Ligand binder design. Structure first.
Ligand SMILES: [Ca+2]
Length: 712
């Protein structure tokens, strides 16, 4: 690794302190007094303290006046030697943040007449914009430093289609980088692209969503969803697939958009659609990736587009997909990754303002609470601005309906509340939730947007890992089993989840209100419910396993809270035992439409459970207080849980509702809390077309759910 040759080193580690490092074998030569120099300036430096290091001797110096950024600084030793003042830790100080915070817009501001380019690079001494265009003249123009560390330049002419890169000079080293706010990029996101507004017209206006507990979330990956040969969709693994109406499998079973609509889901959650690394857009079939390797936060991923070479195309297709879903009454949730970037060292953040956008440990090294290399320092003011900017942009430009925050716990609460204010204002009713894991990132525990602090984040939901493990079984231990798999030890936790996880007797609340509990038993992470259960119950036949998985769905779908379903879960999706399929082949990750046909009856069961939920508000109480007033547990045994919803006068169409979950293949009788005749709406066999009436007792035969209801 080559480098600029320098006599000694000097860094601005704080607004008024300069650290001078002198190579050991020069300690007696390059000695103090040290002076700071710049055009029009030459001041003395006071040595607060000095001490030896491995191969260098250090001097912690103080300056009477705070360092002025944007200009090259020289520090001279008494020996006459000099070196350029480099950037130190000063960038991560509150003082530095308050001095340079910029509240204006950044990026490329286009007009048919001219484009204004702006980049925040407070610690830099120079910046320029590099313009290029297919078969055209390339030009690089110096940018001017304005207030708040912002560099800008106005380029006359119509820049539509022009590619651009920023050149930022930090510590006398120029780095080339894509605009952090790039809203379009070239294939494989190598350069940003300036594009005129595409005049997209949203023709499927939707009123703000009623309430979180009224949603049914369906998590899917754009490639997985339609890549299968029998998917019935033409644009396999592309944005346009979901725009295809009335598609069906070879045997005639509904597929794609029609399928999703038919299931009764309200929100389709998509894995990362912003540009990420992991798939060569030039050869999309040669590799696969979930997409959790952020490159450009304001631009779409190119492998899902019909043509990744034409900058506007991916934008057009993602917007059409979203508008079409809306035309069909479906809403969209975007999985976003503001907790880290792919390859910190070469990221736009690091190349523009070194050390600013990432958290560091006490030793000065990048923290790794995310476990993937770096943690975005959301608490830094321009980072908080970026995240808020990004969320509002996706809402305004792509008209989405919510966001699932990957590693939500890595973000700081103030940032979360700040973006929430801006996001809900731009789009009333949107869903905002994520995995509030308490991770080892350098933030005080009460500042982490973790589950534990849910009480301070009203309007933000969290994946309920407790309810997940209670029903399915511990996720960390393959063999561990949950209530649905026959473990009576988790019956109470399950009942707690059924009640919205907002407190149950001796059990402390998981979240304050049910609107904040994302109830699920499967997601793209870890083994699918089918594969997990297959390892935990190696001696159980497929038929029984199917009943257990259907049981887990009924528990979640008939539970207070916000139901979440992993795509393919409805038909026992399997990944061949793969635990973490982030980069596995399509054979592993594709949505198996053949399996969808095979278990069309099971899929139908979950469809009925969803319709049941939608037709009865009793399952969608809006507060822990209302739940305490209409839900009560009637029986809690190792393999049997019976609860009921009552006093539903102005709540439900039905006067009383009883739900019994049985997790054992044996048969048992269950006494009702009264002798009034009820309607047998469902049993382990599934829903009954013509509900028979039963009295005093009811048979509970095998694994499954029985539902009784009293009309009015
Ligand atoms: Ca990409």
């Amino acid at each position: 690794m080559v480098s600029i040759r320098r006599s000694f080193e000097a860094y601005v580690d704080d607004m008024n302190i300069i650290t001078v490092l002198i190579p050991a074998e020069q300690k007696e030569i390059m000695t103090p007094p040290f002076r700071l120099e710049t055009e029009i300036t030459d001041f003395p430096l006071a040595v607060r303290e000095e001490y030896s290091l491995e191969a260098k001797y250090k001097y912690v110096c103080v300056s009477d006046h705070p360092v002025t950024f944007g200009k090259i600084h020289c520090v001279r030793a008494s020996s006459g030697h000099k070196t350029d003042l480099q950037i130190g830790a000063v960038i991560r100080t509150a003082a530095f943040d308050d001095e340079f915070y910029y509240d204006g817009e950044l990026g490329a501001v286009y007009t048919a007449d001219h484009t204004v380019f702006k980049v925040w690079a407070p610690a830099a001494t120079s910046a320029a914009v590099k313009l290029s265009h297919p078969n055209k003249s390339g030009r690089t123009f110096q940018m001017t430093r304005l207030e708040k560390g912002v560099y800008a330049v106005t380029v006359t002419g119509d820049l539509h289609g022009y590619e651009y890169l920023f050149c930022i000079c930090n510590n006398s080293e120029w780095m080339e980088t894509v605009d952090q706010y790039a809203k379009a990029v070239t294939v494989n996101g190598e350069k940003g692209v300036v594009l005129r507004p595409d005049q997209m017209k949203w023709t499927a206006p939707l009123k703000p969503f009623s309430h979180p507990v009224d949603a049914v979330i369906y998590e899917t990956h754009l490639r997985d969803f339609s890549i299968h040969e029998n998917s019935g969709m033409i644009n396999k693994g592309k944005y346009l697939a979901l725009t295809e109406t009335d598609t069906q499998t070879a045997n005639g079973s509904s597929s794609g958009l029609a399928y999703v609509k038919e299931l009764g889901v309200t929100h389709v959650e998509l894995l990362p659609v912003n540009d990420f690394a992991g798939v060569d857009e030039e050869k999309p079939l040669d590799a696969y990736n979930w997409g959790y390797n952020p490159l450009h936060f304001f631009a779409p991923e190119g492998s899902y587009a019909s043509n990744p070479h034409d900058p506007q195309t991916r934008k057009t297709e993602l917007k059409q997909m979203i508008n079409t879903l809306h035309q069909h009454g479906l809403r969209v949730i975007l999985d976003v990754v503001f907790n880290h970037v792919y390859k910190r060292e070469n990221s736009p953040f690091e190349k523009t303002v070194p050390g600013y956008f990432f958290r560091h440990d006490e030793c000065g090294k990048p923290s790794n609470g995310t476990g993937v290399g770096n943690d975005i320092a959301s608490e830094r003011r321009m980072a908080r601005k970026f995240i808020a900017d990004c969320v509002v942009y996706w809402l305004e430009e792509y008209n989405v309906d919510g966001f699932r925050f990957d590693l939500l716990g890595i973000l700081d609460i103030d940032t979360v509340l700040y973006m929430k204010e801006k996001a809900t204002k731009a789009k009333p009713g949107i869903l905002l939730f994520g995995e509030g894991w308490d991770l080892a990132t350098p933030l005080p525990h009460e500042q982490k947007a973790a589950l534990a602090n849910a009480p301070r984040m009203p309007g933000i939901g969290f994946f309920n890992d407790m309810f997940r493990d209670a029903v399915k079984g511990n996720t960390f231990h393959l063999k561990a089993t949950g209530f649905a798999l026959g473990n009576g030890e988790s019956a109470q936790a399950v009942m707690h989840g059924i009640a919205g996880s907002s407190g149950w007797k001796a059990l402390a609340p998981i979240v304050p209100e049910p609107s904040q509990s994302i109830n699920y038993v499967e997601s793209h992470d870890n083994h699918t419910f089918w594969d997990k259960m297959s390892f935990a119950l190696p001696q159980e036949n497929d038929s029984r396993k199917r009943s257990r998985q259907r049981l887990a769905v009924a528990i979640i779908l008939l539970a207070q809270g916000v139901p979440f379903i992993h795509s393919g879960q409805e038909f026992f999706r399997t990944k061949q035992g793969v635990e973490n399929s982030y980069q596995s082949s399509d054979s592993i990750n594709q949505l198996d439409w053949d399996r969808r046909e095979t278990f069309k009856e099971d899929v139908h069961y979950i469809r009925r459970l969803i319709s049941l939920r939608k037709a009865h508000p009793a399952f969608r109480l809006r507060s822990a207080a209302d739940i305490q007033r209409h839900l009560e547990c009637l029986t809690l045994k190792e393999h049997l849980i019976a609860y009921r919803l009552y006093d539903l006068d102005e709540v439900d169409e039905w006067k009383d509702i009883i739900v019994i979950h049985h997790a054992s293949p044996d048969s048992v009788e269950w006494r009702l809390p009264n002798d009034i005749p009820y309607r047998l709406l469902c049993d382990p066999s599934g829903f009954q077309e013509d509900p028979t009436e039963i009295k005093k007792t009811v048979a509970v035969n095998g694994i499954g759910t029985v539902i009784l209801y009293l009309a009015s």
